[PDB]
Design a protein around this ligand. Structure first.
Ligand SMILES: Nc1ncnc2c1ncn2[C@@H]1O[C@H](COP(=O)(O)OP(=O)(O)OP(=O)(O)O)[C@@H](O)[C@H]1O
Ligand SMILES: [Mg+2]
Lengths: 196, 149, 217, 88, 241, 249, 86, 242, 71
């Protein structure tokens, strides 16, 4: 699996694949990894599917009550819930979560949560098993505060390389864009990026 | 409610535009609608006393509309719009309604104009009886003399 | 379906010799079924026959025949409903002797079987029979009974209208047009607002009685 | 202890409400003929003491100028049962 | 005889304790009026600003339970916050465990059951708030269900709450006599607000400010409140009609 | 602490438990309800009343489904029925659909719900639900049966019964109208007629709620293609259907 | 009992029943020294004439009065007046 | 009748016991809270009942998290117990969401707790009013929490005996500034109305304690105003009432 | 019958709203509606005058339908 999020001037764009391998048999190849735990904070799954999904439901539950009583969550606030649940179950559950959201105060932000439960703010994050192959490409062609169009192509190009080198990543490349402009889903068929 | 800044501000501006009243009045001949908008803001305030003070500025200005024998059609419309909006409670407009009637008497305006404007005044004060009553009977008595002829 | 649409045939129709003949043998067609849902139709069937006039003998004769089959193997409710109709038919046919005899007979047995709001009707019939025999002593006595029974809340608008109608008419004979007039207003409204299907005619009669009261006064 | 029409401040809304029952049928019982109701009679005043329930009574005696009475608390209570009835 | 002190029945077949809960909602003097539109449900409610030292924006009686369900609360403000918190907790629970946002009908019933359990405990006193839930569901359309401190709820064409709410009921009833349908047909949510305010003004015989009102509007799949500027536009439009 | 664990039910000195007498009073402040058992069905009926005329009574339910072939109807307090019917549904599923994998018998279910009442007269912080329920049903082991659940926590089988504040009137009406053999159609006509004398509201099908546990319906079962399996014996009648039966009295 | 600003309406009529150097600064202070009934407004007037007597004045000064409204209020904290009316 | 507990309820829609507990707060020390544009300036009267006492060592001011000052009046132990509970709550929030707890959020949690004890007969109603607020990313806030469990936003609040003097002059303060005053200015205005509220406590003599949380003075952290600046305010207030 | 009215006032949708009424208290409702009409300066009884009056002097009990969930 390959997941990333990258910040950009107007917000944050999210990128994922939709292949999920159990063994060599792909259980489903149209399966969306991009998860809504809040209207303007979404997340990306990797690792064992159940364990990440379970926590994401628990975080959606907890952030609903947070929004209705205590004001809205920031990208930071969401990331900590993920962190603290992974921390109590760092011996039992393994989850890779990239948490990305757009606030209007601090703009788009990326926090990543490894398997142990730690949170780290980064301008871009990559996680999974296919994203270890694209690390050097990602740091080198990453520009801070690119255009929306350049960020979309940027993640497309990185994940085409991820799919080139990982058999656990594939399917279509799905993207969610979190911005002030709204929440825009994009989708990329494999012919489109096997060239790009 | 929890702020007293609107009370202070309506008094300040009424002062300023009552010393700019001659500048406004001269502009009134160039564009009566331009002149009138200066004053309207004042009465969109929530202070009924300072709205009353600034309704005096309007009554003065609308002599020009009254005097003319085609601009009083807009006076009839303004009365209708002011009363319905909020009434600027219901104190401010009582003095306004009253002071149009005296003007119609000294201008010597035609029977037809006197009829229609006063007809608009009674359409509006119909269901109201917050103090309109007092004016309202004399206002209809003006129609009556015309309708005898 | 079969007996319901055959009464549509009957209701159409006009007062005809075939219609007359048909109905005392339509209770033979009714029994042919042997079903217990005859009850629901058998009341409406008779109601249709009453509505247009179909000769003195036949309308009483039909209704009498049904009553026999409403105790043959059927409910006490069905029987008693038809007795209320039989009694009204006799009154119109201007037999007051046959009307009174039946009325005295009905009402006493259903005090062992009292649960009935259908004796309210029987009281109002009883008042009308006495009034036309021209005794107002016992027309008043039954009418008083009927008012008491309708004080308890189960009564239709029709039922309250009938009570108002006789009460008004009694007081006119007592030479008081104040209390009569008060009932004719509420009686009148009942008929005016109850949709016309025989109500247009009674509403007309009540309006005249409202007006009569004010001439005397 | 007489005072002006408006001699309790803030409870002015209660003076207006009082005169509806008292002074409007007093001058003209005739405006209630049109209406058709039983003539307005009877008023109860109650409050926490010190609000001039009685101060109001002295105002509505003075302003109207009608015949006025007035009763001591317990000085129209006698030592004879039914002699204290006869007086009232 | 303690049948007024603990939650046990009297020989009148009534729980007095429970009746006293209804007599607290009329003491804070908040009136509400709620009508079902054609794409919205609108609820307008009084905001009492007593002093110059209260900040009116934090004065609330509209709690936003879920994304789509506002709740307006009539009666004491301590009990209001406890109820709002509970209602929210259960709704989030429902989304979590059944995988979709809680309907209004079912939310009314869930709070009704806990309020009944609070009239079944003799050491937990019921909450004395009457709760109105406004929504537009896509399974029931525009909806109002009003729950009470006893544990009774029923659906409503429109509803009112407060001490003078009998006066409001009359106006609304006439409005539904004429239309002969159980909701107002008007496709603009804004003009359903204007109608709602008209019926409130008739009932209470008082004209309103923007800070005398606090308005919540449930449109299709979102619940929001109007800010104080936006409320004034609606009150300006009352005159335009 | 919270030392309420002492019962709030106590014997009275002339015998009889005072708390449930008080709850029985609450049944006679509630609406009226009745059940007539036919030999080919059951009809149950109740009256609908509202707190506002702006309240809908098309969203008001006082007849509830416990299991598909078994319905309940109450007289008493609304709140007390509302929680308790949920508990009746719950215990049918935990103890006979997780153990015997099917919907419980009518006899069986009625007994279990009386246990729930019985522990609401035991211990502090509880008091009995002040309703009587009629539980009409059909099972495949005892046939049709009609029951009355008491706030005592006792039950009795009946042939026709009433509950509510107008119960005495209703059962005396039904005394003459019940026969050994009945039609379901006649049962409906008696049910609406009996309830006409005990309802002070309208007598339209809008405000009279009617439901039969008559013959089963396999087109409301939600699937087809097992003949063997049978559908809901319950059928709630909507308002127009109830009006047709009012004309058929 | 007089409202928050029903106390104020008595304050304007009872200050014309006394002498003053000028006092039109009631509005905040009386509102927030609430507790009074209508009879206690005229005891604030009399108590401002006791603070006057200390200073040796024959006028009510607002320096006299606003120590008065503070003092009349405090002695009235002695017992409630709790009543439940129909 | 109708005060024997708090599961009694009256036909008056009042709970009597809870109204009675507000009278304990009326017997407390005077305490004020001024909501400023950029913060809040709290001040509390600390009586000198003897020269035996040690000045500015008995705090009625306990900080919660780092940016929420809490100061109270009424029964001093009960309010310290209330603030102990809310310090645990502040920590839990910081645990779970890795951020300091907001002012509206802190208010809600305290309000449920005080609201709970006026329903249970196993736990005794509160007899405290607390005035608490601070600066978080959602602005400055000021909240007053009744023992009945009610709160609101405030442009000015007070509780204690000498709230009569304090409350009035806050109506003039809003009327001075209908867009509020500076954090700097509010130091000398929080001091000034404890000295005017020392006329409901003029039997005794007192020590002024002042604390603030404002963005522009301390950076949105709650700190104590101490040294020469505390003494500058005391010199200001001292002149006003003389 | 005693008083005049406008045909907008209903007498018969006021029976259900309160059941615990004595007749002197129905003489009170109507007499107070002729007081409320007079604050308008109306001499016919409106439903504004009659329902405003109805609400007061009819107090709230433990028997009435103001509180109802016993159905
Ligand atoms: N409302 C008020 N305004 C001015 N003075 C007042 C007022 N109320 C009372 N007083 C002063 O107190 C005196 C005595 O009060 P009064 O007997 O009028 O009160 P009350 O409300 O009728 O009390 P109670 O219910 O104990 O009879 C008055 O004559 C007057 O001097
Ligand atoms: Mg006195």
């Amino acid at each position: 699996t390959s997941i990333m999020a990258v910040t950009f001037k107007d917000g944050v764009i999210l990128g994922a694949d939709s292949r999920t391998t159990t063994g060599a048999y792909i259980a489903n190849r149209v399966t969306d990894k991009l998860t809504r735990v809040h209207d303007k904070i979404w997340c990306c799954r990797s690792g064992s599917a159940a364990d990440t999904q379970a926590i994401a439901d628990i975080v959606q539950y907890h952030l609903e009550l947070y929004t209705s009583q205590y004001g809205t969550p920031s990208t930071e606030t969401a990331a900590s819930v993920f962190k603290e649940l992974c921390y109590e179950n760092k011996d039992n559950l393994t989850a890779g979560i990239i948490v990305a959201g757009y606030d209007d105060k601090n703009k788009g932000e990326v926090y990543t949560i490894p398997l142990g439960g730690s949170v780290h703010k980064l301008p871009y994050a990559i996680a999974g098993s296919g994203s270890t192959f694209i690390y050097g490409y990602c740091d080198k062609n990453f520009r801070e505060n690119m255009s929306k169009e350049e960020t979309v192509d940027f993640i497309k190009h990185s994940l085409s390389q991820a799919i080139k080198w990982d058999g656990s990543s594939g399917g279509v490349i799905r993207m969610v864009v979190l911005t002030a402009a709204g929440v825009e889903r994009l989708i990329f068929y494999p012919d489109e990026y096997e060239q790009l | 409610m929890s702020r007293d800044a609107p009370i202070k501000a309506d008094k300040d501006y009424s002062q300023i535009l009552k010393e700019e009243f001659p500048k406004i009045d001269s502009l009134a001949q160039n564009d009566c609608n331009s002149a009138l908008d200066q004053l309207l803001v004042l009465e969109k305030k929530t202070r009924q006393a300072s709205d009353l003070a600034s309704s005096k500025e309007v009554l003065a200005k609308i002599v020009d509309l009254l005097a003319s024998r085609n601009k009083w059609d807009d006076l009839n419309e303004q009365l209708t719009l002011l009363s319905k909006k909020h009434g600027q409670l219901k104190l401010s407009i009582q003095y306004m309604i009253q002071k149009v009637m005296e003007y119609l008497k000294s201008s010597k305006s035609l029977d037809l104009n006197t009829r229609i404007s006063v007809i608009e005044t009674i359409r509006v004060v119909t269901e109201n009886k917050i103090f309109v009553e007092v004016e309202r009977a004399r206002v209809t008595k003006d129609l009556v003399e015309i309708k005898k002829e | 379906t079969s007996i319901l649409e055959l009464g549509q045939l009957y209701v159409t129709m006009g007062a005809k010799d075939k219609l007359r003949e048909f109905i005392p043998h339509s209770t033979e067609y009714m029994m042919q079924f042997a079903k217990s849902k005859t009850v629901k139709v058998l009341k409406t069937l008779i109601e249709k026959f009453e509505q247009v006039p179909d000769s003195l003998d036949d309308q009483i004769f039909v209704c009498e025949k049904s009553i026999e089959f409403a105790k043959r193997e059927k409910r006490v409710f069905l029987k008693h409903s038809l007795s209320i109709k039989l009694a009204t038919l006799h009154y119109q046919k201007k037999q007051y002797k046959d009307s009174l005899a039946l009325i005295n007979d009905l009402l006493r047995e259903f005090k062992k079987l009292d649960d009935k709001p259908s004796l309210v009707d029987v009281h109002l019939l009883e008042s009308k029979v006495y009034h036309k025999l021209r005794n107002l002593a016992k027309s008043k006595a039954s009418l008083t009974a009927a008012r008491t029974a309708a004080n308890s809340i189960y009564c239709p608008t029709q039922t309250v209208a009938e009570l108002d109608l006789m009460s008004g008419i009694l007081h006119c004979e007592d030479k008081d047009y104040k209390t009569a007039f008060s009932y004719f207003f509420e009686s009148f409204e009942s008929y005016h607002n109850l949709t016309t299907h025989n109500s247009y005619e009674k509403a007309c009669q009540v309006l005249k009685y409202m007006l009569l009261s004010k001439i005397m006064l | 202890g007489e005072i002006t029409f408006d001699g309790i401040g803030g409870l002015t809304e209660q003076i207006r409400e009082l005169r509806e029952v008292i002074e409007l049928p007093l001058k003209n019982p005739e405006i209630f003929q049109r209406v058709g109701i039983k003539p307005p009679k009877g008023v109860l005043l109650y409050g926490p003491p010190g609000t001039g329930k009685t101060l109001l009574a002295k105002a509505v005696a003075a302003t109207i100028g009608a015949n006025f009475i007035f009763s001591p608390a317990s000085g129209i209570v006698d030592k004879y049962i039914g002699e204290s009835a006869r007086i009232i | 005889g303690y049948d007024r002190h603990i939650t046990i029945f009297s020989p009148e077949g009534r729980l007095y304790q429970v009746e006293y809960a209804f007599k607290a909602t009329n003491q804070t003097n908040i009136n509400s009026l709620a009508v079902r539109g054609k794409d919205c449900t609108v609820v307008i409610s009084q905001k009492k600003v007593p002093d110059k030292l209260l900040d009116p924006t934090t004065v609330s009686y509209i709690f936003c339970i879920s994304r789509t369900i506002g709740m307006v609360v009539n009666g004491p403000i301590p009990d209001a916050r406890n109820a709002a918190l509970r209602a929210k907790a259960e709704a989030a629970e429902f989304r979590y465990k059944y995988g979709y946002d809680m309907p209004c009908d079912v939310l009314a019933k869930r709070m009704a059951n806990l309020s009944q359990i609070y009239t079944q405990r003799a050491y937990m006193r019921p909450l004395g708030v009457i709760l109105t839930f406004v929504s537009v569901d896509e399974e029931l359309g525009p909806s109002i269900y009003k729950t009470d401190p006893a544990g009774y709820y029923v659906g409503y064409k429109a509803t009112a709450t407060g001490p003078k709410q009998q006066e409001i009921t009359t106006n609304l009833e006439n409005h539904f006599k004429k239309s002969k349908i159980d909701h107002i047909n008007e496709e603009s949510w804004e003009k359903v607000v204007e109608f709602a305010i008209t019926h409130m003004i008739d009932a209470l015989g008082t004209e309103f400010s923007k800070n005398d009102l606090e308005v919540g509007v449930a449109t299709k799949d979102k619940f929001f409140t109007l800010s104080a500027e936006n409320i004034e536009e609606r009150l300006v439009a009352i005159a335009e009609q | 602490t919270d030392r309420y664990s002492f019962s709030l039910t106590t014997f009275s000195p002339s015998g009889k438990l005072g708390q449930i007498d008080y709850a029985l009073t609450a049944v006679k402040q509630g609406v009226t309800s009745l059940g007539i058992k036919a030999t080919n069905g059951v009809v149950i009926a109740t009256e609908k009343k509202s707190s506002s005329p702006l309240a809908m009574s098309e969203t008001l339910s006082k007849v509830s489904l416990l299991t598909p072939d078994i319905g309940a109807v109450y007289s008493g307090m609304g709140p007390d029925y509302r929680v308790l019917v949920d508990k009746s549904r719950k215990v049918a599923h935990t103890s006979y659909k997780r153990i015997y994998g099917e919907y419980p018998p009518t006899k069986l279910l009625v007994s279990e719900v009386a246990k729930i009442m019985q522990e609401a007269t035991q211990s502090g912080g509880v008091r009995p639900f002040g309703v009587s329920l009629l539980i009409a049903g059909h099972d495949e082991f005892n046939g049709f049966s009609l029951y009355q659940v008491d706030p005592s926590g006792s039950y009795f089988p009946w042939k026709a019964t009433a509950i509510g504040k107008g119960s005495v009137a209703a059962k005396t009406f039904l005394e003459k109208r019940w026969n050994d053999e009945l039609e379901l159609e006649d049962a409906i006509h008696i049910a609406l007629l009996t309830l006409k004398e005990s309802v002070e509201g309208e007598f339209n099908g809008d405000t009279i709620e009617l439901a039969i546990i008559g013959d089963e319906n396999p087109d409301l079962l939600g699937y087809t293609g097992i003949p063997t399996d049978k559908g809901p014996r319950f059928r709630k009648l909507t308002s127009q259907e109830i009006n047709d039966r009012l004309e058929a009295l | 009992l007089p409202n928050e600003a029903g106390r104020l309406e008595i304050f304007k009529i009872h200050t014309a029943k006394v002498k003053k150097t000028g006092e039109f600064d009631f509005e905040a202070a009386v509102k927030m020294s609430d507790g009074f009934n209508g009879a206690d407004i005229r005891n604030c007037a009399t108590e401002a004439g006791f603070f006057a007597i200390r200073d040796d004045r024959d006028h009510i000064n607002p320096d006299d009065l606003m120590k008065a409204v503070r003092k009349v209020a405090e002695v009235k904290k002695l017992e409630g007046t709790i009543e439940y009316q129909k | 009748g109708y005060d024997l507990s708090n599961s009694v309820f009256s036909p008056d829609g009042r709970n009597f016991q809870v109204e009675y507990a507000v009278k304990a707060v009326e017997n407390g020390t005077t305490s004020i809270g001024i909501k400023c544009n950029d913060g809040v300036v709290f001040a509390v009267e600390k009586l000198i009942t003897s020269k035996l006492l040690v000045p500015q060592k008995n705090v009625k001011i306990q900080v919660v998290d780092r940016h929420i000052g809490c100061v109270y009046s009424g029964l001093i132990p009960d309010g310290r117990h209330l603030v102990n509970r809310g310090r645990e709550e502040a920590a839990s929030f910081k645990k779970l969401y890795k951020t300091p707890i907001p002012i509206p959020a802190f208010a809600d949690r305290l309000g449920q707790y005080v609201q709970a004890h006026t329903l249970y007969n196993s736990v005794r109603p509160f007899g405290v009013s607390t005035i608490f607020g601070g600066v978080d990313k959602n602005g400055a806030h000021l909240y007053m929490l009744e023992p009945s469990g009610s709160y609101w936003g405030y442009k000015g609040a007070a509780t204690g005996k000498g709230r009569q003097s304090a409350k009035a002059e806050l109506e003039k303060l809003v009327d001075h500034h209908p867009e509020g005053l500076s954090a700097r200015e509010a130091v000398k205005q929080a001091a000034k109305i404890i000295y005017l509220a020392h006329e409901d406590n003029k039997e005794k003599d007192f020590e002024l304690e002042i604390s603030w949380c404002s963005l522009s003075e301390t950076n949105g952290l709650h700190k104590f105003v101490k040294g020469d600046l505390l003494q500058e305010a005391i010199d200001f207030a001292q002149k006003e009432i003389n | 019958s005693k008083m005049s009215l406008a045909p907008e006032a209903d007498l018969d949708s006021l029976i259900i709203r309160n059941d615990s009424l004595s007749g002197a208290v129905i003489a009170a409702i109507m007499q107070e509606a002729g007081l409320r009409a007079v604050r308008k300066n109306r001499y016919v009884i409106l439903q504004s005058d009659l329902e405003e009056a109805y609400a007061t002097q009819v107090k709230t009990d433990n028997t009435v339908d103001k509180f109802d969930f016993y159905k």
